């Protein structure tokens, strides 16, 4: 695993530094690495593929060393090295696709393919080169039990969920109370409603609350908070809880009163913010607890006072909502986000070669089903496959 990154690092540098006309002292230490790759790899033989429609290929290495005697590199020296690099870079593609496609349930952090088990001998350890990427550095710190961290831009921490809750209801569905929400990606939009507009509430104030637990602990997040849910603002018809009938929701929107956002960790309040919108921070949390309340306005112009009567026909329903959005955070387990394409490389290999459903991952690599039940057996497999997908992205985009 450490020597699979070390093969790809000095094939990336060999296509970049060994160019025509360059001075020899620019590449004097790469050629000592590239010649010492070849000496270790000669005489061995490998075999990749076999699962699904992934074809079986056999690999055999018998190459010669590079020359170490020029002052400026010429077109003979480049063209005799390109037909050696192009055989290794085809070998690393078929080892990385052989490993992203396999999985185990007992110990997923171990290598699973036949070729990567064979590269983990002490014979092949002399190919080891620097480990400077983000995923190979966190592969080594976490293997010694030291603290790691991945930096994300808009991480997919919330599974998809769109539902509601009725704290007061009747079969006519004309005097209701409760909340509605959408949790999707890295964004929460909750909105509380009350059809009577707190005409009989004590002190004309109705209290709402919405608690979102996370799956993993986030660290040093940057969060944007805005006092409107724009998705629950228009008239719509909504089905009932069991799909029997439908009910109508015609909102008018007040401002949210007495907003309190809390950031919990094992039930302890780490941060809190009271009527403070814009950008906020959250240093360590795993549970977000939103709290906001509706207050009936005590003074109303004649255009407003017609909307909220005392009797039963309520044609304009009051609505109070919020909107939260995580911009960037630092987690310790691997996730998906909006910047890098490591999830898209894993699913595209499995979909292309028609791979059967195994014992660990959900069918079709569904991210909503995978972050919902994000077991420690799935975490060790998901890190092992995102790290191999990161090695393949250096050579083959």
């Amino acid at each position: 695993m450490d020597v699979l990154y070390s093969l790809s690092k000095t094939l990336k540098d060999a296509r970049d530094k060994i160019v025509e006309g360059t001075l020899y002292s620019n590449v004097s230490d790469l050629i000592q690495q590239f010649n010492q790759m070849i000496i270790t790899m000669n005489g061995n033989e490998f075999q990749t593929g076999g699962i699904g429609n992934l074809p079986i290929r056999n690999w055999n290495f018998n190459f010669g060393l590079l020359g170490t005697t020029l002052l400026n590199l010429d077109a003979n020296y480049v063209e005799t090295a390109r037909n050696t690099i192009d055989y290794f870079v085809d070998f690393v593609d078929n080892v990385c696709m052989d490993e992203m496609v396999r999985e185990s349930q007992r110990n997923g952090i171990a290598p699973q393919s036949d070729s990567l088990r064979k590269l983990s001998a002490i014979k092949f350890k002399r190919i080891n080169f620097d480990n400077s990427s983000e995923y190979i550095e966190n592969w080594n710190l976490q293997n010694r039990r030291q603290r790691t961290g991945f930096t994300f831009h808009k991480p997919n921490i919330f599974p998809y969920s769109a539902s509601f809750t009725l704290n007061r209801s009747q079969p006519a569905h004309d005097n209701l109370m409760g909340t509605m929400w959408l949790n999707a990606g890295s964004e929460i939009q909750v909105a509380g409603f009350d059809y009577s507009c707190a005409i009989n509430a004590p002190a004309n104030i109705q209290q709402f609350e919405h608690i979102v637990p996370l799956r993993r602990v986030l660290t040093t997040a940057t969060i944007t908070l805005l006092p409107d849910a724009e998705r629950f603002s228009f008239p719509r018809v909504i089905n009932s809880a069991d799909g029997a009938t439908t009910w109508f929701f015609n909102p008018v929107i007040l401002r949210p009163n007495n907003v309190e956002v809390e950031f919990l960790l094992n039930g302890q309040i780490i941060n809190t913010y009271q009527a403070r919108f814009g950008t906020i921070v959250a240093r360590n949390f795993d549970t977000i607890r939103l709290s906001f309340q509706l207050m009936r306005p005590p003074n109303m112009t004649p255009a407003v006072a017609v909307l909220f009567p005392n009797a039963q026909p309520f044609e304009h329903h009051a609505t109070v909502g919020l909107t939260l959005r995580i911009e960037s955070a630092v987690c310790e387990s691997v996730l998906a986000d909006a910047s890098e394409t490591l999830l898209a490389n894993v699913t595209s290999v499995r979909q292309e070669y028609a791979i059967p459903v195994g014992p660990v991952f959900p069918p079709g690599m569904n991210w909503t089903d995978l972050i919902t039940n994000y077991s420690p057996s799935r975490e060790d497999n998901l890190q092992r496959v995102f790290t191999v997908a990161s090695i393949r992205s250096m050579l083959i985009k």
Binding site: L166, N167, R168, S169, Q170, P171, A241
Partner: protein, 276 residues
């Protein structure tokens, strides 16, 4: 607060009990004692309602909380029994002649009946299951039942001749009719003084008790021959003087109230289960 829906209730088996709260029930609720009109004749008083209500103050009930009503007999109480206040208990004498009619009144007020109207002229009638009865009350009810077949022809009756019909009641103030379940019938209610009504029983009534003053203890509240249970709220006590009957009720309020409960229909939580 979610009136129509049914939701399950969880709760731990290790929770401390609440307070006594039998006192606070007496401060708020009401009480109705019923008695036949000859009971006040032996009493020979026009202030004995005042006298009893001084004695209910000892057991926690306030002054304006206990109401008294009358009736002449169980034949004339049953043309329209309607129970008004929160808790009540009725008192009836034993008659060896009125075997069935004591069981009719204890059927009508101790249970709860969901009832639909009927039209003798227009339709043909049948009973669906064991909980379907035909409750009929009025000044003078006389019911004749002509059973039909799968082709709507008479079985033992001519469907035009009303004399060949088959009688189940004669000039009664109240009737509860059980016929065989699943056969279309043709009916002969004298609807000028009677009123038949397709009814259907739910769970029983929790706020009324029955004190059978004297006699033996027989009451078939159910409909079948094969059982006849004696529930918690039907009881019996012997008599020589109606003073002693009334002193026993006033002394033992706390036990009679304990045997009954509040009417589960009367609460807020039954708002779409037939009673707001």
């Amino acid at each position: 607060q979610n009136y129509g829906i049914n939701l399950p209730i969880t709760g731990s088996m290790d929770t401390a009990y609440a307070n006594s709260t039998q006192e606070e029930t007496f401060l708020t609720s009401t009480l109705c004692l019923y008695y036949p009109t000859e009971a006040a004749t032996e009493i020979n008083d026009n202030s004995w309602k005042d006298t009893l209500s001084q004695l209910f103050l000892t057991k926690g009930w306030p002054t304006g909380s206990v109401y008294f009503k009358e009736y002449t007999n169980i034949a004339s109480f049953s043309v329209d029994p309607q129970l008004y206040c929160d808790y009540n208990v009725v008192l009836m004498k034993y008659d060896a002649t009125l075997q069935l009619d004591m069981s009719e009144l204890a059927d009508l007020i101790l249970n709860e009946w969901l009832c639909n109207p009927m039209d003798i002229t227009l339709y043909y009638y049948q009973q669906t299951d064991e909980a379907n009865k035909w409750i009929s009350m009025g000044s003078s009810c006389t019911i004749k039942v002509c059973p039909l077949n799968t082709q709507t022809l008479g079985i033992g009756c001519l469907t035009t001749d009303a004399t060949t019909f088959e009688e189940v009641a004669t000039a009664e103030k109240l009737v509860i009719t059980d016929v065989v379940d699943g056969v279309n019938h043709k009916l002969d209610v004298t609807t000028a003084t009677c009123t038949i009504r397709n009814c259907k029983k739910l769970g029983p009534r929790e706020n009324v008790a029955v004190i059978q003053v004297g006699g033996s203890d027989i009451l078939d509240i159910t409909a079948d021959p094969t059982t006849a249970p004696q529930t918690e709220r039907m009881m019996r006590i012997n008599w020589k003087k109606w003073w002693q009957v009334f002193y026993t009720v006033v002394d033992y309020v706390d036990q009679i109230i304990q045997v009954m409960s509040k009417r589960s229909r009367s609460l807020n939580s039954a708002a779409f289960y037939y009673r707001v």
